Amino acid sequence: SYGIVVDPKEVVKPISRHIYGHFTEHLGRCIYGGIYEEGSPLSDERGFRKDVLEAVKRIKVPNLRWPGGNFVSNYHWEDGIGPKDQRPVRFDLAWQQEETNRFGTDEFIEYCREIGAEPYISINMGTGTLDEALHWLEYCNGKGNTYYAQLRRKYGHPEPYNVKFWGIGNEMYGEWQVGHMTADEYARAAKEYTKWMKVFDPTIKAIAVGCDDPIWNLRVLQEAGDVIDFISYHFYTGSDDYYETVSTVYLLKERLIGVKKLIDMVDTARKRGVKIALDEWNVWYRVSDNKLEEPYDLKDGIFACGVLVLLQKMSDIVPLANLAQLVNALGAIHTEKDGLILTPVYKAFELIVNHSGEKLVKTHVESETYNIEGVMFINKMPFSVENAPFLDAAASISEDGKKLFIAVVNYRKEDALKVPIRVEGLGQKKATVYTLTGPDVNARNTMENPNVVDITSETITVDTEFEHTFKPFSCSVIEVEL
Amino acid sequence: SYGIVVDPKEVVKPISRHIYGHFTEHLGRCIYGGIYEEGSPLSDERGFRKDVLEAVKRIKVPNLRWPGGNFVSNYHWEDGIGPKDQRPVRFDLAWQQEETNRFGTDEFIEYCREIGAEPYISINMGTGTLDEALHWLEYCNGKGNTYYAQLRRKYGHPEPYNVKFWGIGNEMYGEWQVGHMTADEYARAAKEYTKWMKVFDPTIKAIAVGCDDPIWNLRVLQEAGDVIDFISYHFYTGSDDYYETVSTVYLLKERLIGVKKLIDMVDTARKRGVKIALDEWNVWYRVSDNKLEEPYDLKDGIFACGVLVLLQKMSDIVPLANLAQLVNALGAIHTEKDGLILTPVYKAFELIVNHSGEKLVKTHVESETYNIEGVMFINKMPFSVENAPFLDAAASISEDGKKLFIAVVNYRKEDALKVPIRVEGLGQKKATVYTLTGPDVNARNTMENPNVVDITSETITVDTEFEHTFKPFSCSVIEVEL
Numbered sequence: 001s002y003g004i005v006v007d008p009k010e011v012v013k014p015i016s017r018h019i020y021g022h023f024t025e026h027l028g029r030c031i032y033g034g035i036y037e038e039g040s041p042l043s044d045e046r047g048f049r050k051d052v053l054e055a056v057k058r059i060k061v062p063n064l065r066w067p068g069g070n071f072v073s074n075y076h077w078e079d080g081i082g083p084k085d086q087r088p089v090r091f092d093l094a095w096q097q098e099e100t101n102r103f104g105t106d107e108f109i110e111y112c113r114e115i116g117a118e119p120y121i122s123i124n125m126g127t128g129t130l131d132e133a134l135h136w137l138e139y140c141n142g143k144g145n146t147y148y149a150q151l152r153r154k155y156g157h158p159e160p161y162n163v164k165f166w167g168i169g170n171e172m173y174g175e176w177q178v179g180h181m182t183a184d185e186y187a188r189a190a191k192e193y194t195k196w197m198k199v200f201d202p203t204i205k206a207i208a209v210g211c212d213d214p215i216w217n218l219r220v221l222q223e224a225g226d227v228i229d230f231i232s233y234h235f236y237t238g239s240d241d242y243y244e245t246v247s248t249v250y251l252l253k254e255r256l257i258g259v260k261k262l263i264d265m266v267d268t269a270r271k272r273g274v275k276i277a278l279d280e281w282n283v284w285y286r287v288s289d290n291k292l293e294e295p296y297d298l299k300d301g302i303f304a305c306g307v308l309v310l311l312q313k314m315s316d317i318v319p320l321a322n323l324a325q326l327v328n329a330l331g332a333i334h335t336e337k338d339g340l341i342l343t344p345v346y347k348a349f350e351l352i353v354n355h356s357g358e359k360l361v362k363t364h365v366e367s368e369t370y371n372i373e374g375v376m377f378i379n380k381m382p383f384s385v386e387n388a389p390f391l392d393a394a395a396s397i398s399e400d401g402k403k404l405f406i407a408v409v410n411y412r413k414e415d416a417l418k419v420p421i422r423v424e425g426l427g428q429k430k431a432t433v434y435t436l437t438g439p440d441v442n443a444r445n446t447m448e449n450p451n452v453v454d455i456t457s458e459t460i461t462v463d464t465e466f467e468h469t470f471k472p473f474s475c476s477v478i479e480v481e482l
Numbered sequence: 483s484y485g486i487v488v489d490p491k492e493v494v495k496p497i498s499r500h501i502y503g504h505f506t507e508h509l510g511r512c513i514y515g516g517i518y519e520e521g522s523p524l525s526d527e528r529g530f531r532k533d534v535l536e537a538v539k540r541i542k543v544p545n546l547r548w549p550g551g552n553f554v555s556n557y558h559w560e561d562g563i564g565p566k567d568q569r570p571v572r573f574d575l576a577w578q579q580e581e582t583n584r585f586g587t588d589e590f591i592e593y594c595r596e597i598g599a600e601p602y603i604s605i606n607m608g609t610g611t612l613d614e615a616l617h618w619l620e621y622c623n624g625k626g627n628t629y630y631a632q633l634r635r636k637y638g639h640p641e642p643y644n645v646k647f648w649g650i651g652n653e654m655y656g657e658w659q660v661g662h663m664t665a666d667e668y669a670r671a672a673k674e675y676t677k678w679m680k681v682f683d684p685t686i687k688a689i690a691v692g693c694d695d696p697i698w699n700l701r702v703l704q705e706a707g708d709v710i711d712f713i714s715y716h717f718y719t720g721s722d723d724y725y726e727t728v729s730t731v732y733l734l735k736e737r738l739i740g741v742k743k744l745i746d747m748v749d750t751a752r753k754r755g756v757k758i759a760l761d762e763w764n765v766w767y768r769v770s771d772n773k774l775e776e777p778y779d780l781k782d783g784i785f786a787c788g789v790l791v792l793l794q795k796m797s798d799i800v801p802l803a804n805l806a807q808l809v810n811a812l813g814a815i816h817t818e819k820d821g822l823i824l825t826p827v828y829k830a831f832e833l834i835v836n837h838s839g840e841k842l843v844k845t846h847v848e849s850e851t852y853n854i855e856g857v858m859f860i861n862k863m864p865f866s867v868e869n870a871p872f873l874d875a876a877a878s879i880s881e882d883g884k885k886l887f888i889a890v891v892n893y894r895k896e897d898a899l900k901v902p903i904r905v906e907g908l909g910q911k912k913a914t915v916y917t918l919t920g921p922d923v924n925a926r927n928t929m930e931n932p933n934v935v936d937i938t939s940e941t942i943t944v945d946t947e948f949e950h951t952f953k954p955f956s957c958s959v960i961e962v963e964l
């Protein structure tokens with residue numbers, strides 16, 4: 001009644017490297033006090049916090065979304081370029097604070113370069129215009145002698161940045177968004193901004209705004225499905241109950257199959273192969289203020305593992321995802337003036353990113369399942385999930401075919417699972433199992449005790465057939481040389 | 483690379499008996515000269531063709547849809563009740579025929595009772611009204627002293643008919659439909675007809691019109707998803723190419739999944755468990771006139787077995803389906819004045835209906851798959867399907883646990899397939915394998931040659947593990963005791 005069968009020789013499909021994306025918004029101390037802190041003993045001469053920088057390089061960020069989020073829908077990018085001392089101080093409506101703009105476009109790109117991530121910039125469709133968006137694209141990507149390409153060179157960067165991912169607005173349906181639009185307004189505006197941006201630079205990928213309103217998604221696909229590359233989806237979840245939290249991996253799964261089906265229902269979008277960008281996701285239910293310093297625990301980390309395993313299996317449909325967010329705001333990493341904490345949600349990434357392959361292989365899982373009705377999110381909205389598994393898994397192999405990674409999540413709250421595993425054509429080998437867990441479902445790391453929740457390993461012997469015992473509330477990756 | 487693993491002890495879910503339903507429209511010779519022929523040497527005293535009756539009873543019709551189809555949208559049911567000699571001749575706009583109304587509601591119910599089928603009545607939303615629908619329902623189902631209940635008694639039937647299935651309109655989106663409606667009009671009207679019909683009889687099930695326009699489906703679900711029980715889907719397919727035909731089983735599958743996901747995205751409909759009625763489906767690509775006498779061949783037969791196997795596996799989502807149509811019009815059975823022909827589409831049902839269980843058991847199938855771009859239907863619309871299997875199967879057990887049915891489709895056009903089969907805990911035993919196929923993919927039955935395409939049987943030996951070889955373009959059921 002539990003079991004895993006893997007066939008390393010049967011490659012199902014690629015795993016998009018961009019499922020492991022991240023997001024830094026100008027929110028609270030995400031930027032200021034987070035990744036960037038001018039004159040800290042802990043910061044380099046660009047103002048980047050070095051301890052943060054090290055934590056971020058460790059999770060090999062493939063792409064990084066900035067600057068929003070609600071923030072961007074009242075952000076004028078030209079306020080954040082040029083000599084820092086000449087940049088205007090603005091009041092940010094999203095999160096109600098003074099924004100000095102000392103972190104702007106050039107610093108963001110320098111940050112992305114430093115960490116090896118592709119920049120992914122959202123534009124302002126709230127108080128912003130088409131002209132303003134085209135100017136940002138011109139500044140970032142122009143090769144010629146246009147005013148904004150020259151301005152990039154003038155401020156110190158002759159080579160174009162070549163930003164590939166552009167978000168065509170953020171959450172434009174929500175009445176919390178500055179300049180929020182009806183479905184018909186937004187669908188027409190997404191087509192409009194995307195087509196002219198692609199006229200200036202045909203190489204960009206355009207992510208249009210999606211949500212849970214199927215009519216909204218359909219208007220966007222209908223109107224703009226001939227020019228956009230992704231429709232986005234945001235997913236925030238969680239409650240105090242362990243199972244209500246982790247079970248929502250499978251709520252998310254059904255949501256995404258839904259949006260994939262709407263894409264199939266619009267001919268031009270289906271034929272062009274428009275995909276989904278899960279460009280914000282996380283647990284978020286405890287804290288509701290202007291800083292969002294959600295104290296993630298292990299339960300939340302298991303949720304994050306479950307999603308990464310899901311995305312490995314579904315990346316042909318959802319090739320781009322972004323955890324919200326990297327530092328402090330809904331933060332994977334939490335900083336103080338004199339240190340940082342790695343939350344269990346960061347650990348989910350540290351585990352999967354470092355112990356996963358580039359191709360998904362055939363993985364058949366047998367599992368007991370459970371039904372649940374709970375609440376999620378800061379408003380405690382009822383949901384329900386049917387036949388959520390207690391055990392999930394994804395087997396992948398490295399590009400060179402030399403390594404197999406069997407990622408396994410045991411969602412059971414109280415019982416360890418003894419799981420029979422078959423791997424086709426595998427000899428007897430020593431292998432290492434890397435496990436994320438901790439003493440209880442509510443364990444957290446603190447400055448006090450930075451390592452209560454961490455990745456530990458043990459060596460085991462594997463064969464064509466073997467059993468392993470997976471701890472309750474844990475994610476493990478079995479790593480095997482082929 | 484091909485294989486079937488069955489566990490008879492793991493019941494996955496019920497198989498709704500209503501997936502084997504049928505449909506007789508007042509179109510061409512489906513009624514007059516089809517199921518019904520007054521004064522024929524081949525007819526009983528009710529005017530029912532006795533040779534047709536025998537063939538229909540052989541396929542154990544669980545429900546029968548009537549009178550349309552396009553016909554019902556200009557049909558006034560009161561024209562079809564009372565002494566036949568006084569019923570008015572009407573011009574049917576849908577098929578351009580004089581309709582004598584000599585076959586009407588009372589004859590239909592009597593036909594249903596003869597064959598043992600639940601009546602499924604579609605109402606007229608084209609030229610009809612709410613009152614007129616309510617009067618039909620009251621005539622059929624009233625057990626009190628209302629005028630129309632008394633009227634049914636007056637015409638000879640004191641007991642109510644208890645019609646359980648009501649179709650709220652037919653294809654009301656189509657410009658071909660008399661009185662066709664926009665999505666908003668139909669959505670509101672479906673809610674209105676359904677709610678008041680259910681005030682008079684709350685035990686009926688109501689099927690609302692769906693189609694391939696996702697905005698249409700969603701307006702119906704949003705407006706009426708609190709009262710309806712199914713949204714209907716119609717699927718017609720085929721071309722002269724063998725694989726282009728049979729592969730559309732998996733195009734159907736994806737269509738159905740998409741409609742299922744629309745349901746999931748409408749809170750009231752999802753919570754209430756609204757399902758799908760596939761209330762018209764068949765091959766239909768060669769004939770385009772007002773008689774629709776489509777010459778089905780074996781290829782179309784294998785398509786139909788293929789849909790039946792799919793429906794056994796998805797009947798919790800699609801509990802009701804009706805092949806269009808039973809006799810002559812797109813007909814499973816073809817009649818002439820002096821006899822009939824059982825087409826291979828009829829043989830599909832003769833096989834599955836007689837060799838299937840009421841419960842679906844754990845069935846895992848391994849199979850090579852293919853991709854195809856083809857054309858379908860009378861307009862030769864292009865379609866594409868990804869990873870269709872060459873082999874598929876479903877295993878079911880009888881209600882009393884005594885029998886196991888393994889239905890297997892081999893879609894391979896050219897090669898037999900020796901296939902390993904595992905049945906958990908199965909003794910070594912004798913089984914009978916019933917198989918449907920014929921000389922070639924374009925084989926048909928005729929009056930001359932009525933058994934070119936027929937079901938054969940041979941005894942075989944089965945065990946916990948055995949192999950069986952399946953003919954190309956064939957469907958078989960392995961019927962095992964215990």
Ligand SMILES: OC[C@@H]1O[C@@H](O)[C@H](O)[C@H]1O
Pocket residue numbers: 025068069070071170171234280324325330
């Ligand atoms: O990530 C926090 C907020 O969540 C979403 O509502 C917004 O896009 C973002 O600003």
Ligand SMILES: OC[C@@H]1O[C@@H](O)[C@H](O)[C@H]1O
Pocket residue numbers: 171174211212234235236377
């Ligand atoms: O801010 C998170 C929000 O909760 C949901 O209603 C919004 O659509 C989603 O973006």
Ligand SMILES: OC[C@@H]1O[C@@H](O)[C@H](O)[C@H]1O
Pocket residue numbers: 234235236237376377379381
């Ligand atoms: O209450 C709405 C919650 O915010 C969103 O992220 C969740 O998906 C949505 O259901």
Ligand SMILES: OC[C@@H]1O[C@@H](O)[C@H](O)[C@H]1O
Pocket residue numbers: 507550551552553652653716762806807812
């Ligand atoms: O079955 C023939 C026709 O096909 C569908 O378009 C109509 O509902 C039916 O009258």
Ligand SMILES: OC[C@@H]1O[C@@H](O)[C@H](O)[C@H]1O
Pocket residue numbers: 653656693694716718859
């Ligand atoms: O008449 C069969 C039809 O082909 C499709 O366009 C219609 O919607 C379907 O009912």
Ligand SMILES: OC[C@@H]1O[C@@H](O)[C@H](O)[C@H]1O
Pocket residue numbers: 716717718719858859861863
């Ligand atoms: O081209 C219209 C065809 O008629 C319908 O039955 C098929 O689904 C549709 O694609």
Ligand SMILES: OC[C@@H]1O[C@@H](O)[C@H](O)[C@H]1O
Pocket residue numbers: 540832833836916937
């Ligand atoms: O498999 C054939 C069917 O089983 C029998 O009961 C039916 O009469 C026969 O036609």
Ligand SMILES: OC[C@@H]1O[C@@H](O)[C@H](O)[C@H]1O
Pocket residue numbers: 836
């Ligand atoms: O002829 C096929 C019939 O179907 C089976 O149920 C009957 O026993 C067999 O006679």
